[PDB]
Amino acid sequence: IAKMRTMIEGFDDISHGGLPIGRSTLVSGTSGTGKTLFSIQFLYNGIIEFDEPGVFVTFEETPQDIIKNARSFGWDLAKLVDEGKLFILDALSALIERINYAIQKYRARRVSIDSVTSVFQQYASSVVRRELFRLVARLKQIGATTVMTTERIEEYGPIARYGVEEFVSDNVVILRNVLEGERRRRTLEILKLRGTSHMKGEYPFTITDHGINIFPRSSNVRVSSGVVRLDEMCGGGFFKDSIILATGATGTGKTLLVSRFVENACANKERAILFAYEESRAQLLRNAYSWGMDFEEMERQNLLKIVCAYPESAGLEDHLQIIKSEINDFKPARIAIDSLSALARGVSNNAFRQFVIGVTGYAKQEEITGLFTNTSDQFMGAHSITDSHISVITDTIILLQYVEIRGEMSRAINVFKMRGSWHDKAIREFMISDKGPDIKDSFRNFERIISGSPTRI
Amino acid sequence: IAKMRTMIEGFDDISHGGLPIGRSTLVSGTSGTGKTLFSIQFLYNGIIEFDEPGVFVTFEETPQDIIKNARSFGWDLAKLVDEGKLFILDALSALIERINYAIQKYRARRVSIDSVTSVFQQYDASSVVRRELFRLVARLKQIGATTVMTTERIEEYGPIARYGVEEFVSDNVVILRNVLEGERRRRTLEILKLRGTSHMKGEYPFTITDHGINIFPQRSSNVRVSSGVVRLDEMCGGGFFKDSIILATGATGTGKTLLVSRFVENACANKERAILFAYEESRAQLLRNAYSWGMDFEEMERQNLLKIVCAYPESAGLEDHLQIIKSEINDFKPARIAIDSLSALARGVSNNAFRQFVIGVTGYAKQEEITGLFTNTSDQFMGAHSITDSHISVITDTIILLQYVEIRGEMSRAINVFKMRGSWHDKAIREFMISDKGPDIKDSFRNFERIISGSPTRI
Amino acid sequence: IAKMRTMIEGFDDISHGGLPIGRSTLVSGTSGTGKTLFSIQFLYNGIIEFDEPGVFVTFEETPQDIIKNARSFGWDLAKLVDEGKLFILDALSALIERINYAIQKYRARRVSIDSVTSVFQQYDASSVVRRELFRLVARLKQIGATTVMTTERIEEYGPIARYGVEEFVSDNVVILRNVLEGERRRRTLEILKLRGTSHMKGEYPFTITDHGINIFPQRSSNVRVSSGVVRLDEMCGGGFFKDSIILATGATGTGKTLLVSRFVENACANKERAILFAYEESRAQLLRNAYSWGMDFEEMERQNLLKIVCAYPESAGLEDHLQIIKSEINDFKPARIAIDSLSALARGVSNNAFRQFVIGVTGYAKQEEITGLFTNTSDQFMGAHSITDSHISVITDTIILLQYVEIRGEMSRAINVFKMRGSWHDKAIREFMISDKGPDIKDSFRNFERIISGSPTRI
Ligand SMILES: Nc1ncnc2c1ncn2[C@@H]1O[C@H](COP(=O)(O)OP(=O)(O)OP(=O)(O)O)[C@@H](O)[C@H]1O
Ligand SMILES: Nc1ncnc2c1ncn2[C@@H]1O[C@H](COP(=O)(O)OP(=O)(O)OP(=O)(O)O)[C@@H](O)[C@H]1O
Ligand SMILES: Nc1ncnc2c1ncn2[C@@H]1O[C@H](COP(=O)(O)OP(=O)(O)OP(=O)(O)O)[C@@H](O)[C@H]1O
Ligand SMILES: Nc1ncnc2c1ncn2[C@@H]1O[C@H](COP(=O)(O)OP(=O)(O)OP(=O)(O)O)[C@@H](O)[C@H]1O
Ligand SMILES: Nc1ncnc2c1ncn2[C@@H]1O[C@H](COP(=O)(O)OP(=O)(O)OP(=O)(O)O)[C@@H](O)[C@H]1O
Ligand SMILES: Nc1ncnc2c1ncn2[C@@H]1O[C@H](COP(=O)(O)OP(=O)(O)OP(=O)(O)O)[C@@H](O)[C@H]1O
Ligand SMILES: [Mg+2]
Ligand SMILES: [Mg+2]
Ligand SMILES: [Mg+2]
Ligand SMILES: [Mg+2]
Ligand SMILES: [Mg+2]
Ligand SMILES: [Mg+2]
């Protein structure tokens, strides 16, 4: 069974090649799941890259409205109709004959129906099947790949409205929009692909100006973090394609280290992106300048780009897209996320694990040095790193620990781990000043320093 | 697809402009969600904003009832027949023709229908409803008059509409909620879809007030303000920042309310207005305890500089509380506010709903350049461990941790500036005492180990 | 009641022989569970195994579609009319008579029907269906030809069939599932009942591949194999065992992957094949870090001795992963395998489903006489406490615990052979260092107490 490419970023790999040629694919889902978008995008990309005639059947939707709604993604379906490339047929063997006629009037390749469920109001489960079955057979006879749109009531219930459509259609795709904690998450899944292989389970996708966005080397080159001693602690600075992690309690120096790392990019005429999620530009600019860093300058040189946003505003799959797009445009040398902990609150651990995998996978695929920070939810930072499942994904771990010494709340920097590279295994004390960090010596005559409450030995 | 600004505080940002032009927007929700209110507001804010002739189609309720109902928001029916700005049509093609007639009659551009699900009593089938509902929107689309369609739902997280077909016929779907969690109703609005345009997905907390619907979707000065204490001001490196959020965490009876008192006192002392949002004790008690420390809060209220807003945290919703703060701040326009306490507002509340609150209050306090001192009673003896397990301690710019320290078989207390964003601060846990004139911050414990625990040992 | 071997890897053990002779077996499941595949396989493995004339009755799909569909498993339709081994009948007594006719026509013994629930569209009542369904099985029983009946279900844990009556009419009931848990589908097969015979109750994880359905239901040599390290080999008492499972637990960045590297290196060093199943880092990174320790994994791959299979643990199901290992081991046929790591495969997975995995991998590794070194990042600083809270540390024959030890305000690490089944081993927690040539296992900490905690104290 040959597969037809849809040029939909993600789907091509999730369906292992694309949609089965000659056969009809069902794309069911609730309202606003992107059933119509997918159907158009299948046709559009079809004759916008392969020039293979395709006709779109429409029921409770004026062709103008479709072409108008499609203009939201900068598409000219009217220009495609002004060259006889696409054909919108306004809307039961009558349609079957008309559809077969149109198809042959162009010499078909792809067809889209939106929606068949709407053209079954009058018709009763068994009646829908008998008519749906007959349709499904009258397409395979012509040998045209058709995407069939179907309506759903529940997100985790019947596949179709009458629960007899999935058993007729050869290929079943389910578009979802699950609401968890007042946050909407779009997930696409291929339930079955008769006579072929595909990826099982749902995959986080987002709808943008590009349309559907489904999301399914190792050089010894070293880059500076912005601290001479920190580079000496890491054994000649970080790697130019690795993922660093600054874990620690609130007000330790995670944002300070991010700044010094983002600065060191613009210091070497290298572009960097800072994704803020905790503070705003306003505070970031002041705090930065207080440490002797001119962020405003770095932005004036077109080397730094600050992108602050509320973590609880957009969804995790949306946050990633924003990064990708922001990285695709600016093309930064190194990026920083301040912080991951801000994007994990009010989210599932499974949905968050996939996020860090995506950002890490895309940061390393483009050879971009990433410095992600994370606020530990325990005083013993050593124990917080173990509970973190993202700490095994990262290549370097820079843990900042509070240490109570002589009734003073001092701090300590330590390179926890450094993959395929030597690092200093000493918990060096450090202080913050108007210039930045001052990594001094490591506590020698002190035991149980990992607790954050040591004892003189 | 052009957007029609509804002028509904919040919706204009969540809709990325507003409602699509010449498209049929559906608004489903359970009984008392605030559909009609939204529907009226849409027309109301249309007429008295961009001189737009709006036509309200009634069904269940009469024009008089609607006119009288909207009188709780101070909206007159002088735009009705007195001006010809509105057109309340008391109540399938028979009605559609009337809407098409009244349209060009007043040049009507904005249209509201309530309710469209009440005109499907003569039927019982979804197929019969779909066909008749599809015919309506289609007819309105030809007129090119972007209208609002009201529908009713049984469940809050069930089908979009009563017949589960009205959402797929319409282009724009807005779902108003009133979800009951722990005997507390939370009004949340969501835009499900917007055919041919973009919007914000997921639900957004809103409230109904005398203003109607209230949807809730580079300064950073180095200027320093006093905290009310001198040692504390020195501990932070010349007092707190102006547009900064301070947090005083500690065990119950450490001195969170004491610090809040001095912070509010210091405002009125500099002839600056302050607002104290009490949630634990009542004005009566607060007035007494304040004076015991040598502070006349009654005097400060007599100068129209300090305003105390006491209320039970287990009565109104977090969204209701936020609106109260906003309104109380918009009225009085203080220099600095104080919340006593966040912990009291977090009792029997979803951690999601709490974060959204604090973000909103922090966001509005920093936007209006207001110094906020929020308190939070720690749920452990080790205050440091409480700070770590908090999704707010990262949001606050300054953290003032008050810790109990058992020394020489005595219940002594210690204060320390945990953190101070973009500022030097004393990194020492110095013991403090409370007297009849406020706090006396003494010296830190040089010869003591494991003070964070609260049960230290002499070195 | 005699059993008909279906030759379906796993089913033959779960069915205690196979399907009952001259009895009507029902196979219900949701859409895409793999009913037709099972139905074809039943006939396919019947013809090309014990020369059995099988008749496939179609209903919804045509013979051409089915023939073309089964071409993804490399099965030709040369057994159809080209030989007369099969009999695809395109589509109540009218059909039954045809089945009874075609039966003796080809001497048909095996029969498959798909789907029997599609021929109940003309009806809507269960009583009408039951009567017509009962008549079918009864008629087939008289012929004495044991057939497979396909049915469709709406829910995964709801009624057995669409009309909830087909299970009680049939004698044998098999339920295929595709349960979605955490955006991950798990294919599980169960035999509900087997009237007049015994079987295995509860669901069993299976997978669909190019081989079709893959259901997953006294040696013990004293021979010793090297671990790649000399001190470690001495610590275990002359290296690890051959058909033994080793486990390296510890905190992130202790040296689990380092040990895995030496274990795999030592294989290829003795001209032995090894497979490294990476799940954390990618070949790119692994290749670099390996060389930094003085190991050329590229060289080992150039000798066709080492094979690296990197893949994301949060993409495929545990059953999908097991099949991959099995296939990759069946192809390459290594001396020793390595999993880096089990912890990475246990992320967002049911503890039940994980145990079944490890049992399966451990079981297959010990059965094929393959030395396995599985790693597992501990979720606590105290490694000993992690070992205890593990349903796998008891399954492993050897445990190699790597522990972080803060000594003289330095992050030093310690290694110790936690346990070694039927073998003496060094019972000392000796400190080790990592350099550009692998690990340097030094001496244990004689003058240190509470080392298990990770924060010891000088004695
Ligand atoms: N430019 C855009 N950027 C981002 N999102 C957009 C944009 N344009 C549309 N969308 C979103 O994409 C969704 C896809 O709309 P579409 O018509 O494909 O939905 P549908 O599933 O077919 O709905 P229905 O079945 O109710 O007709 C819209 O509802 C809207 O939320
Ligand atoms: N100008 C300064 N001079 C001295 N110390 C400073 C100065 N600015 C900041 N600090 C110190 O360094 C800290 C900086 O905190 P930073 O934001 O870098 O860390 P963080 O852990 O990421 O913070 P958060 O968790 O609150 O986001 C302050 O809390 C303070 O202790
Ligand atoms: N002035 C006001 N102050 C506070 N709350 C108010 C005020 N006016 C109305 N409300 C609240 O908002 C609601 C408005 O009811 P509205 O008619 O808008 O709801 P609806 O969803 O249209 O109801 P129905 O299902 O009957 O059509 C009131 O029931 C009340 O709970
Ligand atoms: N007049 C006083 N003289 C001495 N100590 C006093 C006086 N008034 C209060 N205190 C001390 O301060 C404590 C109360 O301080 P405050 O009310 O600010 O604490 P809090 O942490 O906000 O308390 P709660 O958790 O109950 O709201 C008393 O328990 C006592 O230890
Ligand atoms: N070669 C292959 N490799 C991997 N997966 C495959 C392969 N062939 C089939 N599959 C998977 O197994 C399924 C087989 O579908 P099958 O027709 O056996 O299911 P069914 O339960 O009979 O469906 P229906 O409800 O339509 O009758 C495919 O949909 C696909 O998910
Ligand atoms: N070339 C090297 N020189 C010195 N030490 C090194 C070198 N390469 C690695 N290390 C040390 O070994 C650690 C990595 O070892 P390894 O990757 O085997 O550990 P792991 O426990 O499997 O890590 P993870 O949990 O991240 O998968 C580094 O953090 C460092 O301490
Ligand atoms: Mg649509
Ligand atoms: Mg920060
Ligand atoms: Mg009303
Ligand atoms: Mg108090
Ligand atoms: Mg099938
Ligand atoms: Mg590793």
Side-chain angles (χ1 to χ4, degrees), chain C residues 22-23 102 108 111 136-138 140 142-145:
Chain C
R23 304 212 97 118
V111 178
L136 170 35
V137 278
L140 277 167
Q142 276 173 30
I143 316 201

Side-chain angles (χ1 to χ4, degrees), chain C residues 337-351 353-368 370-379 381 383-386:
Chain C
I337 65 163
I339 309 260
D340 221 348
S341 64
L342 293 170
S343 45
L345 294 124
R347 326 203 270 221
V349 167
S350 39
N351 283 311
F354 194 48
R355 281 188 300 264
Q356 306 193 58
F357 174 87
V358 216
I359 291 339
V361 178
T362 288
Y364 195 63
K366 290 178 99 200
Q367 165 183 343
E368 305 314 317
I370 297 166
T371 320
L373 180 81
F374 301 8
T375 95
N376 170 66
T377 301
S378 46
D379 49 15
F381 201 66
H385 291 191
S386 278

Side-chain angles (χ1 to χ4, degrees), chain C residues 200-209 212-215:
Chain C
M200 268 155 94
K201 340 310 225 286
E203 343 177 13
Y204 295 90
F206 79 88
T207 52
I208 273 112
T209 56
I213 309 250
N214 229 349
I215 307 160

Side-chain angles (χ1 to χ4, degrees), chain C residues 142-145 148-153 155-180 182-209 212-215 217 220-230 232-233 235-241 244-260 262-264:
Chain C
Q142 276 173 30
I143 316 201
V148 151
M149 297 255 254
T150 296
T151 320
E152 14 175 284
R153 333 169 50 206
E155 267 142 25
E156 225 91 23
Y157 291 108
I160 301 307
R162 184 183 284 279
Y163 302 107
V165 99
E166 306 90 305
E167 62 262 26
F168 280 108
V169 143
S170 317
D171 4 45
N172 324 320
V173 173
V174 173
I175 299 146
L176 312 207
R177 296 203 185 69
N178 203 14
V179 184
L180 186 79
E183 306 193 357
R184 278 286 91 72
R185 293 213 109 97
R186 178 168 159 110
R187 301 185 168 284
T188 81
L189 177 149
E190 177 193 11
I191 323 226
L192 180 49
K193 62 157 171 173
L194 273 201
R195 265 212 209 98
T197 181
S198 65
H199 63 117
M200 268 155 94
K201 340 310 225 286
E203 343 177 13
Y204 295 90
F206 79 88
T207 52
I208 273 112
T209 56
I213 309 250
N214 229 349
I215 307 160
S220 190
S221 83
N222 264 108
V223 89
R224 292 233 183 203
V225 309
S226 183
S227 64
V229 193
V230 208
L232 210 204
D233 273 18
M235 284 195 76
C236 298
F240 303 145
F241 281 124
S244 70
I245 305 296
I246 331 289
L247 169 73
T249 37
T252 184
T254 40
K256 280 151 308 211
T257 311
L258 165 51
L259 287 205
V260 165
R262 283 291 203 105
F263 171 86
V264 139

Side-chain angles (χ1 to χ4, degrees), chain A residues 94 102 106 108 110-113:
Chain A
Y106 298 87
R110 13 192 105 195
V111 165
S112 296
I113 327 219

